[PDB]
């Protein structure tokens, strides 16, 4: 009854950040030590919780949000951040309690000639609310005239490919991100630490 963290962290395919993936964890023992003892991660930040105290806590659900962004944007996956990722793609609440985990995925997500399969939302009329997920492809009005769903001058498609090439500087290299959220509702607490 081990929690299937392997399915999240070792997934072959990861989501585009605009269309970020959420995995619900339930009905399992969570060995958090496999994550925090690991040398596979370069970012491992926990807000208002320490992965060492999770080992003797029980939750109703744990959520693992995952996507790819470029290296320079990993700082945006934090409470109170602004920028295209925090504003238009994936937003943490100001009072976030959870962990942000990232690692360089240049060996998997970059290719000679460029991998263009990972997308982000470049334009939006307003900022996302925390944990909001926008997969809409409405033509974005950038000018003073309405688009009526037709692309043209000042009337843009809202998504854009990242360009990951293995020779990119680390700031433009792909990073895989996992965000862990811990939930305790009015239900039996089915996700427990080994104690």
């Amino acid at each position: 009854n081990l929690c299937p963290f392997g399915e999240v962290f070792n997934a072959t395919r990861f989501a585009s950040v605009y269309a970020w993936n959420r995995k619900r964890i339930s009905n399992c023992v969570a060995d958090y030590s496999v994550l925090y003892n690991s040398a596979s991660f370069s970012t491992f930040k926990c807000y208002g919780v320490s992965p060492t105290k999770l080992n003797d806590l029980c939750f109703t659900n744990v959520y693992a949000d995952s996507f790819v962004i470029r290296g320079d944007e990993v700082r945006q996956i934090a409470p109170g951040q602004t920028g295209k990722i925090a504003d238009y793609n994936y937003k943490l609440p100001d009072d976030f309690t959870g962990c942000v985990i990232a690692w360089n995925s240049n060996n998997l997500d970059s290719k000679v000639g460029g991998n263009y399969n990972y997308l982000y939302r470049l334009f939006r009329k307003s900022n996302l609310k925390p944990f909001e997920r926008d997969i809409s492809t409405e033509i974005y009005q950038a000018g003073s005239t309405p688009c009526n769903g037709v692309e043209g001058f000042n009337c843009y498609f809202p998504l854009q490919s990242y360009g990951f090439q293995p020779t990119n500087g680390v700031g433009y290299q792909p990073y895989r991100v996992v965000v862990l959220s811990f939930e305790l509702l009015h239900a039996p607490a089915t996700v427990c630490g080994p104690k």
Partner: nanobody
Amino acid sequence: QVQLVESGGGLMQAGGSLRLSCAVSGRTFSTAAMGWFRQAPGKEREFVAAIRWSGGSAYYADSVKGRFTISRDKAKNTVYLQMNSLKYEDTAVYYCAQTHYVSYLLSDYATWPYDYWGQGTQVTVSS
């Protein structure tokens, strides 16, 4: 990878209309845009029209704007080039191309080097 197979070419009299097809198979979920290009004997390959897979907005070269129409059937993974008001200057081999590259800017599909290419279909316009 995707495979592009074009059909519908042939001989037509000037003033007529013809529809070319390009069927896409393989990794069809990756499709961002489709483009049509043409190459006349002794001339360089020339962009004709592009269509974004999501939403269906179209971009045309000046030489066909108002005459040709590009459309796509997502369910059938097929793009169409409706060639109306055919002229002698339209005689060429027509090639369809696919890319998974998403640009915010539709006009970039006129100059983007695409990922996969069809075999080409001959269109000949009679006097």
